[model samples]
Target chain A: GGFNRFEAAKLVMQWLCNHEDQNMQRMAVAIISILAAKLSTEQTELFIVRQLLQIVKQKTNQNSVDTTLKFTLSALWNLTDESPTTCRHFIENQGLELFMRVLESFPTESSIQQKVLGLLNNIAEVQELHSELMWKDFIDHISSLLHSVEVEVSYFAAGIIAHLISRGEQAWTLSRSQRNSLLDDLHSAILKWPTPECEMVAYRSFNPFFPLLGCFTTPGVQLWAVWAMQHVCSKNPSRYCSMLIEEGGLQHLYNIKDHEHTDPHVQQIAVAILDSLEKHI
Target chain B: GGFNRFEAAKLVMQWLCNHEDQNMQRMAVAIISILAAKLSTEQTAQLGTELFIVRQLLQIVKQKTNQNSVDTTLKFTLSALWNLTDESPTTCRHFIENQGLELFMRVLESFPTESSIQQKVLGLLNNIAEVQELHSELMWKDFIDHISSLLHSVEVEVSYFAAGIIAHLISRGEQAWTLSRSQRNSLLDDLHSAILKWPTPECEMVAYRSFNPFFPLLGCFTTPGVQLWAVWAMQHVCSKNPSRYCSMLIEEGGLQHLYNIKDHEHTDPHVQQIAVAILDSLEKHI
Candidate 1:
């Protein structure tokens, strides 16, 4: 018989309820992380998300090697990544606290940090949550982590900051000094980054749960930095673009765009920003 | 003041309930449609469902259908219906309870020449059909006849919608089997023909390269709905009666078409599932 993802998800929920064995629980969550990508319907996704939420809430604590909680958060991230309604549900279920608890529990673990940051990046995509997240110190946390030792952590943190302030109305809410500081740090971040990686890494490093690939990772920080710059310029292009050119941001964007075999996802944005710069400068 | 979609939806609902002037009511429904897209979650999508919103919208549709005018008012009302039912089972239930589906059919009947109205009605039906829980209710309403007639529609979108509804209906094995033998054969025949007519090329091309430039350049296929549903119906037909439908599918070049879509890198994920499933079944049967 074909693998029934829905049936598997239901049985995993049952296993979580019935068993206390760490291996069994870890195995169950691993299955759930994979199933999140497979299941399509809102009802099915909701079923899995509600169960994952329960596990995350129950198992979350300042403890060591809590593989179960790690996998549960990863599954939750995948479940919420593509669905705005699910993201809203995660918020209603106190998802921010769950996220903060995981980060607090493993403050120094790059694996854990990457997953939480990746999840936050997905959450930031939800338009409805923009105001709530901004008010909840979500912005404060990401901006603070802009220069973390872990490149993956800093990479996603930059992406989230860019995403949160992407909208003009949202950008307007920021104080002039705060916006300037963010742009200055963002500009330098773009200029200092290496040329886009020539080879697709053995696998995408961002998805931590995939073990065969070494834990935690990057493709293009320059893409995210430039992507963020584009959003900042969108509000007042001429002013921001002039500021960008002054700081060598446009030159870096052109560099990434002209690089051979750049990731299309990355190149597309680089090209877009270069066009904006030409228009404004 | 900052724009709050929920509050705006409430004010629009109040205007609708007041049954103000016709033009005012029309404008209210138009705003509701925009709000529906903006507020996507179930909790937020339900704002219009409260305050007798679905009923009032249905009244407008009913009233407009009676006039037999494919005016902007009717178009807006149908667009609002599409957005309201979009992913909310609660709103979908409310919509059906208020005879929205039958009312839409009447609108389509009266305005056969109005392609925009036909597209809107089809869009609304497609939205309603997405709520799997409503499939039984839709089937009970003799929706198969309404949809089957649309398979022959001159408009490509209407035919695409008819294909989608049929795919959802047949996914329920026994539920679809409940259709009379003649009905089943008729539906299968429609699926057979639709698959053979799969329009997108086998080779990949960017969206900008497609003839319909306005459509998203998703690989070779411009019409995701048409491709998704066509493959879905094919899968169900093969699963339910491989012996009966398999040879007919192969004869119509359905296998090659399914293989092409499955191999195409840009195929919508859901469509790929159905196409691959059908192809696997066919390969095994052969």
Candidate 2:
């Protein structure tokens, strides 16, 4: 009924490269983003994602680049969603630095901030990336952005942190102080939530067919917060357990669990954290 | 990231029922047909099936009886039903009890040129015929009569689907062959001509399916593939009751057609051999 995906990908690349209007190029890249999910072969997904990466590399700071960059980052995220190798490939090709530069250059562009952080979240999905010095450096840089005014920025900031801490069961094994610093940082992010006045982020900017992501609220932030705490508690149960309990983390989790009862993700994590806290008692 | 199909189907149904824009309804029904493929048995079975969903789809099918050339909502609804009933005998019975068969036949007759619609129609009939419990005299009669004419459809896919339906019906037993002698000869005569002309140059170049579930299992029939199964069907017809169909085939020049295929160069040698065997079977009886 339609062109084979190879032909479609080629046409998209041609449009991205030769299209007269930047807006048209952006639209082409956006279509690549959607098609990334449907492409079954890794070679095609990687090829499309690399071409999109090339576009982002060529134009990062231009006045008109934010829209294209956001969608391009989205295209990369879609390509890397399930492929650990693709995520590693992105990092290896200096994708981490490109994303880092986007974060550093676009301090106030919350849209850019959200997508760059989303790209990092996907990169962090690869377990090997967690131990990379470059990734660790990247993580250290974004730790402060966890409190960004943009909910989505903070959402992905907290998401990346959750993903890193949630890896391999050694519970922040760098050193005693490093573990405490990491736990304290995560605890601070988890508590800084439910900002009733935070700007409402509509999710329809990316997908038109479904008008679904009704309104962004602090529940998303709290969901990731609880997820991070669960990983922290699971890392080294004895030391973090009483620390989490003493930090009023137990009460906060329950409050979010009972309050955000409708959101199964938040409630599920909250219940899990509560269960972990109870084991220490 | 996407809504579950049940919820998606619900939204689509809502849009279809409430929307005034015909285009919107058409799009909604198209979504239903696509999601219909993902629905699991538990969601479509009797105990848990959502009757309202069936009712809405049927209503859409009933309302859009005009069979206009452009709009495809009616076709998609029927396709959705075909997919929903593909595995569930329960849904198959429910569909028939609601007069689905008559609606399907109407859609088929109205849109003779719509190959996609014809494919879905044949697909649904195939599913309905799969339900052993519903294989009543009335159902079988309606199904066999409707699809028999479609075997000669210009659209290779429609013809293949029709062939599949007939193959399954014929496999049911002797009672299925109870058609009048004239009726049997008419079908054989049609098959005789369709086979000789089949693997039509376009069909040979482009892959076409002949899923004659009775033989060669399931396969895309292309490049001599149709004749292989056409000969197989001819063989089955002759074997079922040599006395009845042997004379019928000889009378229709079925043996001559087989021999022509046998001697014809560039015919798939395998299919030609099968044709020769069928010819031998017919000659022995004479």
Q: Can you list the residue pairs that collide in candidate 2?
A: none
Residue B88, model 1: Cα distance from true site in angstroms: 1.6
What TM-score number comes out for model 2? 0.48
lDDT of 1 by residue, A72-114 (tens): 8788877776577887888888888777776667667776777
Q: Tens-digit lDDT track for model 2 on A1-281?
A: 00122333343355344356665566667766776756662553556656777777766756345667777877787777657788878877878787777777767888777777766776665567776523455666677788776666776677666555555336344544543455456546655655434332212111110111111132444456555455546765665667777766666666665663346656776688788789677
Candidate 2 lDDT by residue in tens digits, B1-286: 9755467656556776768765456445544553454345555564225535566677687777753543444655766666666556677777778787787787777778888678767776666765666666323455567778888777765775676555444445445456665654465446445654544323211111111222332121232433554565566545654765577666655555666676776676657676787878877885
**Which candidate gets the maximum lDDT versus the true structure?**
1
Q: Lowest-lDDT window of 10 residues in candidate 2 chain B? A: B203-212
Interface RMSD of each: 19.0, 9.9
**DockQ per candidate:** 0.01, 0.04
Error of 1 at A45 (Å): 34
State each model's CA lDDT, in order. 0.60, 0.59
Docking class of 1: incorrect
True contacts kept of 2: 0.00
